[PDB]
Design a protein around this ligand. Structure first.
Ligand SMILES: Nc1ncnc2c1ncn2[C@@H]1O[C@H](COP(=O)(O)OP(=O)(O)OP(=O)(O)O)[C@@H](O)[C@H]1O
Ligand SMILES: Nc1ncnc2c1ncn2[C@@H]1O[C@H](COP(=O)(O)OP(=O)(O)O)[C@@H](O)[C@H]1O
Ligand SMILES: [Mg+2]
Ligand SMILES: [Mg+2]
Lengths: 578, 471, 127, 41, 40, 385, 159
């Protein structure tokens, strides 16, 4: 290995001399405690090392050694239902060793080295295996963890272990060359895992929220973003999307956010149930945590570790959902590092390559044909935190040009305590058209037409709001007033949802379809009535309005009957009146 | 250990910085003391060491130093503070020396002031409700034990009075939650950064009048003291608080006087070192540096103690897009924003309910923790007040003679809200009285309006008359 | 009525501080009684050895205005031994390194450096 | 309309000034680092 | 309330004197321990 | 050094009605008076230097015009000190560093002035210190920092400007000197924001430590309304603690009278926006009355002429008398309108002439004038029935 | 320019009202130009020739084709001459400066060359001192009969 000595210490950055032959972006051990670092600049005989932990107390002249490898993760059984730090060190083991505090220099193994796994082989001696082929499978909380050939490995099988109890470190397959395959392998976080082919989005990613599922859907393998000022409600939305989604495995990344949020997730999830199968929610989650006060250089590593684990579980054939708690913190970490490097800032202090890094991260999402010929997907939802809420900010601008869906959060609605508080004017979705056949087959044969009508009503209401501002609601004619009232009914009774309510939290697609149908029928009837001369005031007093307003609180197994009752009541209310 | 190593060879003194050559045995972050030709001894910290030289920030002013007779000696490799249980009732300056005239303390142990981050697995979810006696906080922005809740203030607004009143009236209500009336007062740790003599006099006389000085620890850095000591004072305060709470199961309330002065000092150091500024001159690591301060509060599983943090900061020109309030909003769990428009009208305390927010609110409100209708009542109040403001703007645009009766009811509701729910001069309200006043205010609108409150609660509570509250 | 409890706490603190100060005065006298003790020619050598081991490549030593022959006996180890009349405090009063920049101090009035940490121990020993 | 126009020009002036200040600090830092390099040869 | 101050003043004096007389007993052991710690 | 710092509880009377009444500043407190060019900073500070009740006045001309220094030296020797009755110049110390004098000497001027003021405080007097402009001081700091090649913070000012300003303003307060006697220092520092913008770094840094904020407005100055103090944007933090002194020395019911005046001013300020879009006639009688009484207040109470032989100086009793006259007129006006009397007839009442000239009546003649005017007011509406 | 020429032509002191009785000696005029065009200069010259005042004036002209950095020196020389005349030959000097906008622009250009710390719109932070060193040279001195009077004229950008 290379062994050099510290030439200069300044914050988290250490200059090491005598490091000729060091390679860029390799892992190093700094000081006698063996703190982990990364070489980011080579100059003459020196190297620039950024330390992933606190450097207070180091001295000039202490050794620096180079591991010779870039940052990597251990991929294998034992990751689910676990919580990690920014570079994949289990936090429970750290707590057992150290205490309530996190001390530097602690080294632990990401996967448990003593647990016993039930191994059942799926290949036989003499067979030919390529990167990504399935060798054998072990049970993991009712899943089926498939053991994979590492992506750069090919050869012929000499011997295979019989079924039984083994640990992760026991090599179960040996090849002709002599390379031995264990139950786990390592992959560098900065290299995308290779695939066979990239597919087109085909099916929706059911988030459980009416506004997102209906107006701005996102497809499996798609990408979305949720920018907004603090207090608007990103964290609640992301937690709900983790809890209610239809994804097989959920990977949550806490890039530099409030720790109490991680604690809330940790405390609450073991008491919730997976909607898909009924087991506890936490048996499908990998939770990467990196609070605000944790070392600054580890946020980028946190993002990369999260997406790499997601890619692995996609290779297994599952459909993985990934949430990045805040990418603005990732940008801030990059800015701090570049400020240490004395690099030229590009705009607002950000380094030049911020857009390149963001694009490289967001392009890892998609639906693919895996190297083993199985099908899988990764869906990425990143949260953006502009400084003042200014949407001209370079991070929001850069992420605006790469995502397929945009969910802009309104501060005014957040002040009103009107949630989900999504600014309808500034939001869009490009996955609308590709999902139409699926909607016809699974929801209703006319679902696209209803959502088009709802969108047209909203556009007309927003268009009239200018005149409403100019002269006031009292000066509009009856038809325009009716359109305003219909827009208000839609906003208050359809787009609004309560996350902490027992019933309103999750709404299936058919329920949303029925609610939209009811509202549209009422709009037809009111228009016909005003064309007959009925005064607008009585229309706003009919008893069916409370039924429309209350429809969202109806539990799922009661909705089919209540919908028919409400439709009959809406028809009768205007049939009898005139 | 007991050896004293000195370094001459100072080559550069400018502003707060001082370069000493050789000195490769000064650890990064070490604490030193600068002795000049006249014998006076200052203090300082190493912020960057190299083979050529080391960089030292001088805590005091640098008057009278010279390159020919000064020397620098090492004190310890890691900055530490001496803690004990017997600092309750003492006063210190920003650097931690006593200023109350009494002998120096004797530490039970020495703890590093930079602190260590709490393991998220070890933390605990905060549940316990704190009744501050202020309606605009208790009902709408509930404060729970273990939360940090800054107060966003302004140039002339009275944030100090609000903080003092909160500390004077803050208490939990175990009778409502049925946990046994343990009845333990909050211990107050007070950290001041560049606080003027007028405000300091006010706080001292207030604590003296309430008698809470017997269980208070004070760290004071007045406006005339050196400006570099402000980097250490919050960390001294939080180390003391964490020791007390998690070593003796105390319940500590921390008040930080002015984080604005802290950021002033931070960028002064950052600009002396010629580093790339992030925004308006502030360093690019201000987010990390502030997060190392704010995040040292919370509650730890298996321990009875707690640290509740109330920073106070002044928004320049009342702009919450300024870097300081912006970053603090990204770090803390909410904010209580004061409004000058209420202050000019004579409303105290001038808490604006709309931009205010409490993130941990619904961990601590509901059935078994307070009265049942808390959450829905708060939501309905928010909706109605927003409607009132919107109608105010409508009247600004067009004459009010076109207003419907509905608009008039909402407008009168907003006025009554501002004059009765918010306005209370130095008055302690139990949560019951505040909820009763809230229902009385809501009874100004028909049951058809109150969409966000369930019918059962309407049946039990709607219909009170505001004029029956007081005789 | 908090005035009485305040006064009691202040009086208790004052008594403890005064007693600890007297302890320090007695220790100062006892340390100042070292020079004529038979262990003194040993402690001077131990101070010098600690000072030299702490500072590699030292150039010079200073000593008592007596030009202590006990310290001179280490002339076969380092280069130069100089006398320091003003440097009264007993021990090795300075260790000039090879560069004139750095000096070392292993000498009595290291009690100042030790008292801050042993004060709690002597306080619990007393009470 | 005149009030909105005045507010627009005020905001434009403020943003321009902030941008100029940032540019001047960038030039100062870049020149100083270059000068240190030149002295270091 | 004057009686409260009159009682507590002499109470404080008595307790301070009690602590001083307590501390005078084990003083020489204390100075011996300090001297043992300081000396190399 | 001193022994102890004390709480201010007595007022520093300046002789100007609006400052002494609406926004008082105590002895030992500090005030800041920003304002765009021509708004009246210098005249206000000189008026404070001529009519204040402080024992000694130190005027620091930091980086301003020289004609002002000549004006002081030529006029002050003829005028008389209010307290001892001797020449006014026997009371004042001038520190003069005009604009074209060397730039680096402005900081020296500031520190010299504050140190001399502290000395005279140590002697047991109460000293008033007036800084002509601290913006010039900050300009000198910026220039020296430029010569040093340091990184600026904002608009070129060094990042330590706020600390220097805090150190300067903190040397004020009522103290118990080392000799055991009592003395105080009051600092009134003027700020010259660029373009009349209150978001300047100097103004924002000053507002964080002063106890009073006297905002000058250019629009009031264009109309030749002086002192041109914006009463909506100003504030004072000593108003609550000076109440016992007011009850003892001015009158028992003075705080309520002042609150009533302030509330009336707030109401007419609120109605200004509505009235300026529709016209005074389109409003009910109560609002027309409140607008007219607001006009009376702002033309006959708040306004003050510094160049008049009598209006230049105004005691607290005179202000109390004027406030009582206005409030009596207002209450009678509400009663009369409630009875049904027309607003225009009320406006053309002649007693308003007595109100309008009340501030031009000398201090000796004032009490009898006030009594006759009060009888005239109470008799005017009674005849109007 | 029209107003400045009219003031130069019509300036009188009215001694009879003041009771001095002193004869009104005509004003001496100093006219300093910084980057004026040819039409303005011709207008000024014909105005001065017509009113007969060209025998009492000192003209310091910097035409618009002249180097910019020279505009720094012109007001300094003009006021030096004015002060000399007023305070050593008992004249009453009336000084008009044509366009301080050009002077400030020249100052800004040389400052941007020197890489000074800017002010509020790129102007050097010491512009206040630089303008003050020019403006403050006017006034009257006790013990002497001469005087210096200034009416500089400047165009506000964007009004
Ligand atoms: N109370 C007053 N009564 C009459 N005139 C006044 C009054 N206050 C101000 N003025 C007028 O305002 C003019 C300018 O005021 P002043 O010199 O105090 O302003 P400033 O803001 O200090 O100006 P500068 O830019 O020179 O610092 C005076 O010449 C005077 O005519
Ligand atoms: N969908 C929702 N349903 C109900 N309440 C919500 C919803 N979204 C946000 N909130 C409320 O708004 C608050 C916003 O907090 P949070 O989402 O953590 O903030 P952020 O904008 O930083 O993501 C939550 O604490 C919760 O009280
Ligand atoms: Mg959040
Ligand atoms: Mg002035």
């Amino acid at each position: 290995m290379i062994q050099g000595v510290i030439q200069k210490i300044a914050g988290p950055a250490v200059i090491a001399k005598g490091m000729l032959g060091a390679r860029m972006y390799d892992i190093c051990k700094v000081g006698e405690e063996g703190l982990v670092g990364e070489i980011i600049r080579l100059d003459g005989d020196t190297a620039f090392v950024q330390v992933y932990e606190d450097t207070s107390g180091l001295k000039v002249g202490e050794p620096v050694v180079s591991t010779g490898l870039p940052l990597a993760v251990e991929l294998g059984p034992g990751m689910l239902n676990g919580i990690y730090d920014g570079i994949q060190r289990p936090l429970e083991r750290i707590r057992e060793k150290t205490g309530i505090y996190i001390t530097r220099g602690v080294v632990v193994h990401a996967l448990d080295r003593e647990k016993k796994w039930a191994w059942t082989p799926m290949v036989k001696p003499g067979d030919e295996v390529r990167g990504g082929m399935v060798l054998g499978t072990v049970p993991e909380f009712g899943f089926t963890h498939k053991i994979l050939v590492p992506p750069d490995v090919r050869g012929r099988v000499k011997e295979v272990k019989p079924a039984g109890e083994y640990t992760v470190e026991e090599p179960v397959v040996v090849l002709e060359d002599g390379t031995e395959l264990k139950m786990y392998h390592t992959w560098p976080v900065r290299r995308a895992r290779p695939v066979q082919r990239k597919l087109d989005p085909n099916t929706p990613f059911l988030t459980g929220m009416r506004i997102l599922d209906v107006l701005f859907p996102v497809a499996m393998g798609g990408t979305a973003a949720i920018p907004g000022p603090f207090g608007a409600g990103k964290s609640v939305t992301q937690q709900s999307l983790a809890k209610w989604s239809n994804a097989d495995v959920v990977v949550y990344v806490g890039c530099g956010e409030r720790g109490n949020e991680m604690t809330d997730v940790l405390v609450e999830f073991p008491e919730l149930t997976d909607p898909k199968t009924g087991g506890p929610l936490m048996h499908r989650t990998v939770l990467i945590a990196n609070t605000s006060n944790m070392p600054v250089a580890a946020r980028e590593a946190s993002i990369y570790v999260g997406v790499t684990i997601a890619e692995y579980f996609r290779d297994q054939g599952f459909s993985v959902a990934l949430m990045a708690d805040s990418t603005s913190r990732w940008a801030e970490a990059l800015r701090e590092i570049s400020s240490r490097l004395e690099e030229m800032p590009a705009e607002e202090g950000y380094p030049p390559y911020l857009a390149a890094r963001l694009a490289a991260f967001y392009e890892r999402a998609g639906k693919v044909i895996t190297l083993g010929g199985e099908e899988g997907a990764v869906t990425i939802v990143g949260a953006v935190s502009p400084p003042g809420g200014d949407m001209s900010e370079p991070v929001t601008q850069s992420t605006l040009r790469i995502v397929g869906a945009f969910w802009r959060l309104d501060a005014s609605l957040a002040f009103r305590r009107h949630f989900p508080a999504i600014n309808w004017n500034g939001s869009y979705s490009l996955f609308t058209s590709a999902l139409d056949p699926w909607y016809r087959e699974n929801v209703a044969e006319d679902y696209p037409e209803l959502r088009d009508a709802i969108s047209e009503l909203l556009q007309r209401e927003a268009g009239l709001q200018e005149i409403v501002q100019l002269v006031g609601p009292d000066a509009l004619q009856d038809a325009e007033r009716l359109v305003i009232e219909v827009g208000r009914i839609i906003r208050e009774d359809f787009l609004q949802q309560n996350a902490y309510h027992e019933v309103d939290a999750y709404c299936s697609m058919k329920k949303a379809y029925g609610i939209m149908k009811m509202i549209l029928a009422f709009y037809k009837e009111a228009e016909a009535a005003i064309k007959r001369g009925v005064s607008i005031d009585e229309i706003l007093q009919l008893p069916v309005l409370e039924r429309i307003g209350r429809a969202r609180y109806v539990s799922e197994e009661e909705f089919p009957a209540y919908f028919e009752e409400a439709m009959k009541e809406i028809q009768g209310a205007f049939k009898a009146l005139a | 250990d007991l050896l004293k190593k000195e370094y001459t060879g100072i080559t550069y003194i400018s502003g707060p910085l001082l370069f000493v050559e050789n000195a490769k045995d000064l650890a990064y972050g070490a604490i030193v003391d600068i002795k000049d030709g006249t014998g006076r001894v200052r203090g300082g910290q190493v912020i960057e060491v190299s083979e050529e030289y080391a960089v030292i920030q001088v805590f005091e002013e640098t008057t009278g130093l010279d390159l020919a007779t000064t020397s620098v000696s090492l004190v310890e490799d890691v900055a530490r503070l001496g803690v004990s249980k017997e600092m309750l009732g003492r006063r210190f300056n920003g650097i931690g020396k006593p200023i109350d005239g009494l002998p120096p303390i004797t530490p039970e142990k020495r703890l590093p002031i930079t602190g260590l981050p709490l393991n998220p697995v070890a933390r605990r979810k905060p549940e316990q409700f704190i009744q501050t006696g202020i309606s605009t906080i208790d009902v709408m922005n509930t404060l729970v034990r273990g939360q940090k809740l800054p107060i966003f203030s302004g140039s002339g607004l009275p944030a100090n009075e609000i903080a003092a009143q909160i500390a004077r009236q803050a208490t939990v209500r175990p009778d409502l939650s049925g946990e046994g009336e343990k009845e333990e007062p909050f211990a107050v740790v007070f950290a001041a950064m560049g606080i003027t003599q007028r405000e300091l006099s006010y706080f001292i006389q207030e604590f003296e009048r309430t008698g809470a000085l017997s269980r208070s620890v004070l760290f004071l850095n007045k406006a005339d003291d050196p400006t570099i000591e402000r980097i250490l004072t919050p960390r001294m305060a939080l180390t003391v608080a964490e020791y007390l709470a998690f070593e003796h199961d105390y319940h500590v309330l921390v008040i930080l006087t002015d984080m604005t002065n802290y950021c002033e000092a931070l960028r002064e150091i950052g600009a002396a070192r010629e580093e790339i500024p992030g925004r308006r001159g502030y360093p690019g690591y201000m987010y990390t540096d502030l997060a190392t301060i704010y995040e040292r509060a919370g509650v730890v599983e298996g321990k009875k103690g707690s640290v509740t943090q109330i920073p106070i900061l002044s928004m320049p020109d009342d702009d919450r897009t300024h870097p300081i309030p912006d970053l603090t909003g990204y770090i803390t769990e909410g904010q209580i924003q004061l409004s000058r428009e209420l202050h000019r009208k004579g409303i105290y305390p001038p808490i604006d309910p709309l931009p205010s927010l409490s993130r941990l609110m619904n961990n601590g409100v509901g059935k078994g923790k307070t009265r049942e209708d808390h959450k829905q009542v708060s939501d309905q109040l928010y909706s109605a007040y927003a409607n009132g403001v919107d109608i105010r703007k409508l009247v600004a645009i067009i004459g009010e003679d076109a207003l419907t009766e509905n608009d008039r009811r909402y407008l009168q509701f907003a006025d009554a809200f501002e004059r009765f729910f918010i306005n209370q001069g130095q008055q302690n309200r139990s949560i019951e009285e505040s909820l009763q006043i809230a229902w009385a205010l809501l009874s100004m609108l028909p049951q058809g309006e109150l969409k966000r409150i369930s019918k059962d609660h309407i049946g039990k509570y709607y219909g009170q008359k505001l004029e029956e509250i007081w005789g | 009525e908090s005035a009485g409890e305040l006064l009691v706490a202040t009086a208790r603190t004052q008594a403890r501080g005064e007693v600890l100060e007297e302890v320090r005065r007695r220790v100062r006298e006892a340390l100042e009684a070292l020079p004529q003790k038979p262990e003194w020619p040993e402690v001077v050598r131990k101070l010098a050895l600690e000072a030299l081991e702490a500072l590699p490549g030292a150039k010079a030593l200073v000593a008592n205005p007596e030009d202590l022959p006990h310290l001179e006996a280490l002339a076969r180890e380092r280069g130069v031994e100089l006398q320091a009349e003003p440097a009264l405090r007993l021990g090795v009063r300075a260790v000039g390194a090879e560069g004139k920049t750095q000096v070392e101090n292993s000498l009595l009035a290291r009690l100042d450096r030790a008292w801050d940490a042993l004060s709690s121990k002597v306080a619990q020993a007393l009470w | 309309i005149p009030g909105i126009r005045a507010q627009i020009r005020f905001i434009q002036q403020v943003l321009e000034q902030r941008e100029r200040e940032d540019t001047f600090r960038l030039k100062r830092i870049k020149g100083k680092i270059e000068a240190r390099e030149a002295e270091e040869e | 309330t004057e009686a409260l101050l009159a009682r507590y003043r002499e109470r404080a004096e008595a307790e301070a004197k009690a602590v001083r007389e307590k501390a005078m007993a084990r003083l020489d052991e204390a100075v011996a321990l300090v001297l043992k710690e300081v000396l190399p």
